[PDB]
Amino acid sequence: KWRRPSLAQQRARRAQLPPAFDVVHWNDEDISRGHLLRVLHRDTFVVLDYHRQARMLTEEGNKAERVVSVMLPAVYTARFLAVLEGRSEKVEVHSRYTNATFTPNPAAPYTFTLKCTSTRPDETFEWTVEFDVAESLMLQRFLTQALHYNTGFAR
Amino acid sequence: WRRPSLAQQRARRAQLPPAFDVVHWNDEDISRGHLLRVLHRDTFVVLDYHRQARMLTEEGNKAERVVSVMLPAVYTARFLAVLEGRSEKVEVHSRYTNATFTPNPAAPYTFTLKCTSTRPDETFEWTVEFDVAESLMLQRFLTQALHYNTGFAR
Amino acid sequence: SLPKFEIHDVRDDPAEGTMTRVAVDGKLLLISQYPQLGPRKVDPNDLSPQFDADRRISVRLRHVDLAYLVGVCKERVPRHRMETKAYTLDFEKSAQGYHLHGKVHRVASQRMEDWSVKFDNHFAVTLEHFLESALDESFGFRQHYA
Amino acid sequence: SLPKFEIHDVRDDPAEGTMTRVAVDGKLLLISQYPQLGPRKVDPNDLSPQFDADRRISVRLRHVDLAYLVGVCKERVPRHRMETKAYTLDFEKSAQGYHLHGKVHRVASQRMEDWSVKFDNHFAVTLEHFLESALDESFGFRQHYA
Structure with a gap:
């Protein structure tokens, strides 16, 4: 009973x-x-x-x-999920601060790549995050839970 | 309202x-x-x-x-193993029930529950067929039962 | 307020605009659709509705139908046909997503009409996730344990 | 108490018996095993433990290892090797289930030993469900929204 x-x-x-x-x-x-x-x-x-x-x-x-x-x-x-689940080959995010893509990485099955060019008042910063098999699975489950909760299934 | x-x-x-x-x-x-x-x-x-x-x-x-x-x-887990295709059968044996749950070869993803129930000694034989939808409901139901029974919602 | 998702398809030619809603109340899926009412709104001051509830389509499915729809998503069955006094609908997986179609009647208008709606691309993913979530939450575990 | 499952494998020959426990604390999987202590207990009056907590194996994995284990279950990777100062373990999928094996040390001992545990048949199903559940609950959604 610590x-x-x-x-x-x-x-x-x-x-x-x-x-x-x-x-x-x-x-x-x-x-x-x-x-x-x-x-x-x-x-x-x-x-x-x-x-x-x-x-x-x-x-x-x-x-x-x-x-x-x-x-x-x-x-x-759902657009990111579509890429993770293999239905879409790409999802693009466009804003006045962000221009990014999320796509499968040819180098290995079930791996993906987040590439982004950020901008701020005129400043710019380019960055990339590789998702290996585990990290991609983590993102797919995370997004699945976010969509489940945001839809109201836990109310 | x-x-x-x-x-x-x-x-x-x-x-x-x-x-x-x-x-x-x-x-x-x-x-x-x-x-x-x-x-x-x-x-x-x-x-x-x-x-x-x-x-x-x-x-x-x-x-x-x-x-x-x-x-x-x-x-x-034994019923889930049959539903998921890893096992060809689960048998339930007790003083009052002798039952089997197996895939139904006549249609993919469907299953059959066959049971002989006894009571102190009258008996009663019954069978319930689970079609593709009923089978899927059973699999999701047992999946949720295992999740909650394991403590994941505490 | 029930878990739901909506597809807003506002057009220039209002005759073809629709708002489709997929909601679930426990074990029962409620699929509805509202025809666009008038031209696409522009003025933020315009509080009139963009869609027409008096001309909506509204169908209710059974718990087993929710499980059949998930089975079509999982490709355990090619399709599922549902028939009640109110409608006759087929749900099938297409190369681009899912197609729900058949004969229904609008609210307060006993008179059947051909109807079709598709859930494609990211909307197919949205529908897949919604149906799987709905089926998992349909038994009452979360509320019972809470 | 953490979500967990246990496999009580009591044998006529104590030497071969074990109690294996798989638990999860948020993002971190905790896998433990206790050697059987003496013959199978037959007297409900006996209050001695059937297994030996003082000679246990206890390993802790990382959040990413949990994801890798699910990936092995899903066949996206054939084997996942984990190496830390405390252990070197491989997890792989077999024809009968899953096999976790390598070098570990027992509690309060630096003397490494070869260890192997299998989750076959219905226990392979138990393990798969536990890992998928743990990974889904590992982000904190349920506790956050409650």
Whole structure:
């Protein structure tokens, strides 16, 4: 009948924060090429938070720093799912801040690629996130849950 | 809108055991009509087999329960194995039931539940065919039963 | 408010515009469609409705029909035909998505008419996910355990 | 208590018996196994444990490993190898079910040993359902929306 301090604390954290999963691509060998994409669900939007690796994993401080955040309206969920499920060969997202595509990666079955060119007041930042077999499956289940909940099936 | 009957209806669906019905009425020949209710109650999957009591045209209860088979949680994966094609058969053996659940070779993705029920010693033999839709409902139902029984909704 | 998705297809020639709704109430799928009412709206101040409820189509399916529709999505069966006094409909998977068609009648208008609606591309994915979700939530586990 | 399933494999020869547990804590799968302790228990009065928690194996996987295991179930990959400071384990799909095997150490011991556990027949179905459920619930939607 223990008393768990942290266990109680992280329980509430997980519950309050947005449902999400992380696509981690660290690279201490070369910090400039390491990145983190956190995929979350907040206020009916699927949010893609792209981060660059800050410092090597072998040191204090936050290992990542958020560089750009793309918010995808609910209508894009089914279009991304269509690519993950093999019905569509591509989905394009166009905004005055984002121009991105999500497509299958020829290199291996069941793998996909997110390529994006972001812009802000005139600044521009190009980034790519590869999804291997596991990461793609994670995105397909995540989007499946987001569509299920956003549709109202858990009310 | 104030919807009292509708509110009472949802209170009933929430309170009663999660379930679905396999309905095989036969007004043409009442003796061939039947209803199998598949439910989840207290960790068990329960099979309530009913005979048709009256034509759907007359008044009163259309079904009368004849036998109820309570299946321990362990049978869930065994029935799922048959539905999913990994197993060719599951046999349920107890003091009061001797039953088999197998794929029906006459149509893909359909299955047959055949049972001989005994009681302290009267006996009663019954069979319920699950067509493609009923089979799929059974598979989704057992999938949900296993999910909730395992603790995933706590 | 029931779980649902809607396809808004507003046209220039209103004669061909429709709003199609697919909703579920427990075990029962409600598929409805509203013909466009008038030209495409433009003025944000215009609070009139874009579609016509008085001329809507509204069909209700049984729990087993929801399971047959999922079976067509999973390709366990090529198609499913449903017949009631109110309608005669076939649901089949096409190369581009799904096709629901047959004879129905609009509200308060006893008079049958040919009708067809397709759910293609991303709309096919939307329909697939909605039907699978609906079937899984149709037994009452979530509410019972809550 | 975490969602989990257990396989109690009690044998006449204690040496071969085990209790295997698969649990999940949010994103993290916890796989444990306890060696049988002594002969099969026959006296309901005996309060000694049938298995030995003090000689258990206990491994923790990463969120991405859970996704890889589902991918093996779905046949998108034939094998997933996991290497950490604590263990080296392969998970693969066999004709009868699934096989998880490699090098691990028991509790309070740095002495590595060869270990193998299989989930065959209805236990392969139990494992597949558990992994798909765990991956779906791993994002936090249910707890967030509640």
